[PDB]
Structure formats: C-alpha cells, structure tokens
Design a protein around this ligand. Structure first.
Ligand SMILES: Cc1cc2nc3c(=O)[nH]c(=O)nc-3n(C[C@H](O)[C@H](O)[C@H](O)COP(=O)(O)O)c2cc1C
Ligand SMILES: Cc1c(C(=O)NC2CC2)nn(C)c1Cc1ccc(C(F)(F)F)nc1
Ligand SMILES: O=c1cc(C(O)O)[nH]c(=O)[nH]1
Length: 372
C-alpha cells in the first residue's frame, strides 16, 4: 500500500509542497527521492489496447515524461517505474550550463500553470551520456525495463554561433544510447533559438542531424532499447503563424522527419496575474487548447504523414484522448507531474482506458486522428 503511487501521504506532501516550497526545490526533492530509489512504483501490466507506436518504437502505454524534467538523466529508472512508457531526457548541450539566475520557475496553482526561464541548465553532453550509459547497463539486467524507451533532447549552448555544430557534437556522443533524438528548436529562453524554425534553416538542421546519425555506424553498436539507430523528432513552439506552420510542414515532409513534438511552452498566455512581466514560457492547463489546435493544424499540413507526440496541458484521460483524436500517437506529461504528483501515470492510464471503452474504440490506435 505504501509503494502504491496513490498512497494518501503523497497527496498530503504534494499539497504542502505546492503551498510553501519553491518550485525548483520541490523538483530537486523529487529527483533526490528517485536518485535513492525511494519513490513509489507501479509495475502492473498495461492494457494491450492502450499501447501505441511511432514507426518501430513500441510504447507499452501512451504516456511519457516530457523533456526538462530529468535534464541530466539521473532519475530514469524511478520515473519510468511510476508507470510511464518512455522519458525524454535533456535538453542537453555540448558543454554544461547553470542556466539563468534563480528564482526562474514559478507556479500558479489555481490555474495549474507554470512559467520558467531556466536557460538549458544541464551537466553537459558528456556527463549526461555517462548517466545514460549507466541506465542502459542496468536495463540490460532488468527485464521490467527492457521495453521502456528513452529519448534525448539536444540543443545548443547559449554562446554557440552555428547550432549544427552543437547538434552534431551531441549526436556523436550520446546518439548510440538513444532510442530517438529530439531537436529542440523551440525553447523560448535561449536567445535566437526559435529563429531556427524558419524553413531553410530547419531543413539544413534536420538533414545535418540525420546525416550525422547515419554516419555513426561507419565511424564505429546500438546500446538502446530498439537496438536500431535513433529516430529523429523535432519539437516545435506554438507561437507561429499559419504561413510558418505550412512552410515547416513542407520541410518535414521533404526531410522525412520521424515525428514532431507539439509543443513547447508559449508566450501567448498572459492572463495570469502573478506571472505578469516575468520572463519565460508558460506550461500547464492554459496551454491545452492552444497546443491541441496546433496538433490539428500540423496533422493536416503534413497530410497525416508525420506522427505527433503531444505536449501541453495534459492532466486527464479526456485531455489525452483529445490530443489523440486530434492526431497524436503518444502523450508527454510535465505539469501533470507537478500538480498531481506520484499518481499522474497510474491515474491518467486508468482514465484513458475507461474512456476508450466508453467511446466504442477497439484500441487506442483506432482513435488516432478520428476528430478529422
Ligand atoms: C521547468 C521546465 C523546464 C523545461 N525544460 C524543457 C527542456 O529542457 N526541453 C524541452 O524540449 N522542453 C522543456 N520544457 C517543456 C516541457 O517539456 C513541455 O513541453 C511543456 O511544459 C508543456 O507541457 P505541459 O503543459 O504538460 O507541462 C520544460 C518545461 C518546464 C516547465
Ligand atoms: C510540486 C512538484 C514539482 C515542481 O514544482 N517543479 C517545478 C515547478 C516546475 N515537481 N514535482 C515532481 C512536484 C511534485 C512533488 C514534489 C515533491 C514531493 C515530495 F513527496 F517530495 F514531497 N511530492 C510531489
Ligand atoms: O525547451 C525548453 C527549454 C526551457 C529552458 O531550459 O528554459 N524551457 C522551456 O519552457 N522549454
């Protein structure tokens, strides 16, 4: 009963943390609990009707943890054992960074919103690779983790001129241990990063990343879950106009990107009194509708040819079903872990299974894109 993530004390501690403790400190405490493997766990098998896939990536269930939660890969086992099918570590950069000055994370509990200006704080590609190699060694000896997927989000150091150099550096160090690589061109907290979403720049970035991944073999294998070379995803920002979204879509089709993560934080949420005039991008429930509309738009601009990982405002099974019906094959959570806590995975999985049964869906795959 105690290791059950729905134990009552966890909600007691969650409420106390959300009322009296700084956001980053709460996060650091969660990571500390996982580092010592004293977090609750849920090793129950998941419904075979709720599993999903992106190409050859077979997700035991449709819920993972978004990037920026385990930036340095120091907590992969514990987070996954909460009930998640995958996690995206990072975003990492070649050299470590401490990020912007603190406090840089703020919460609004009433609206279930977060705002952050972290600035790609992380231990750097080389250290984080060592943490991921340790996990992959543990995974090779634990059967309960053999189907779990780990992706790596890569970006650039603040002072780097040509992003492709930094992306290549990361791919050549951590790529062989990744099940997929997420190209982060959508953080609002690294000056000029979002400009790389322009079509011509993005195209060259994607081809450069894919060419570097395809060269890992020759340069001398796959110490990951798929035992295959990592897929390539792009994470997009929701603060784009329609012509930019159409131009990106055309590039994603030409370059054969394996999927698109929709979406990162936004600067369009400005009705939160306590966040006014603050730096950073907003996450949480207020982002849900904005990011779901973005899924529908890109699902149609890419003619349904590009799989979608949903990110933004997902708290309930209904929220997740809305993303799936809009076009998503899998969902990523972040703010749900902040405001619901340890029970996030267990609870949302049960809710979705109930909804699939209620709505007359045979399985989750049948629901993908049904809104359209
Ligand atoms: C504190 C914090 C740090 C984040 N860091 C990253 C990051 O490093 N890379 C990334 O791609 N997204 C990052 N994100 C964005 C989340 O991955 C996610 O896309 C966003 O929070 C929307 O999901 P949500 O509304 O369910 O929280 C971060 C978000 C927060 C709140
Ligand atoms: C809140 C919170 C946060 C958080 O505010 N992140 C920064 C705003 C972005 N991140 N997470 C995992 C939680 C849930 C949590 C933390 C600690 C504990 C406890 F058991 F250790 F007390 N329980 C639940
Ligand atoms: O992709 C990202 C990165 C950050 C950050 O490190 O500041 N923050 C976000 O909201 N999204």
């Amino acid at each position: 009963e105690s290791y059950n993530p729905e134990f009552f004390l966890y909600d007691i501690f969650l409420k106390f943390c959300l009322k009296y403790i700084d956001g980053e400190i709460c996060h650091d405490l969660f990571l500390l609990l996982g580092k010592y493997n004293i977090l609750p766990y849920d090793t129950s098998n998941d419904s075979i009707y709720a599993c999903t896939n992106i190409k050859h990536l077979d997700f035991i269930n449709p819920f993972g943890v978004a990037a920026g939660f385990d930036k340095n890969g120091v907590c992969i086992d514990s987070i996954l054992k909460l009930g998640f099918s995958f996690i995206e570590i990072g975003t990492i950069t070649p050299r470590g960074q401490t990020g912007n000055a603190k406090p840089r994370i703020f919460r609004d509990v009433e609206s279930r919103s977060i705002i952050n200006s972290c600035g790609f704080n992380n231990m750097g590609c080389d250290k984080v690779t060592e943490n991921l190699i340790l996990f992959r060694k543990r995974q090779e000896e634990d059967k309960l983790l053999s189907k779990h997927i780990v992706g790596v989000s890569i970006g650039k150091n603040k002072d780097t001129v040509n992003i492709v150099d930094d992306l290549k550096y990361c791919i050549n160090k951590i790529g062989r241990y990744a099940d997929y690589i997420a190209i982060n061109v959508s953080s609002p907290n690294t000056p000029g990063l979002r400009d790389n979403q322009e079509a011509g720049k993005l195209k060259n970035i994607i081809l450069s990343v894919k060419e570097e991944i395809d060269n890992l073999e020759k340069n001398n294998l796959w110490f990951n879950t798929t035992k295959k070379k990592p897929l390539v995803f792009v994470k997009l920002a929701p603060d784009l106009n329609q012509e930019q979204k159409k131009e990106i879509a055309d590039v994603l089709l030409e370059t054969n990107i394996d999927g698109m993560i929709i979406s990162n934080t936004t600067t369009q949420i400005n009705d939160i009194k306590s966040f006014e005039n603050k730096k950073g991008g907003v996450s949480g429930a207020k982002l849900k509708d904005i990011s779901t509309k973005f899924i529908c738009e890109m699902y149609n601009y890419t003619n349904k040819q590009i799989p979608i990982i949903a990110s933004g405002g997902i708290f309930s099974g209904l929220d997740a079903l809305e993303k799936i019906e809009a076009g998503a094959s899998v969902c990523q959570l972040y703010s749900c872990l902040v405001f619901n806590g340890m029970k996030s995975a267990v609870q949302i999985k049960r809710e979705l299974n109930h909804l699939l049964y209620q709505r007359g869906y045979y399985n989750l795959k049948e629901a993908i894109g049904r809104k359209h």
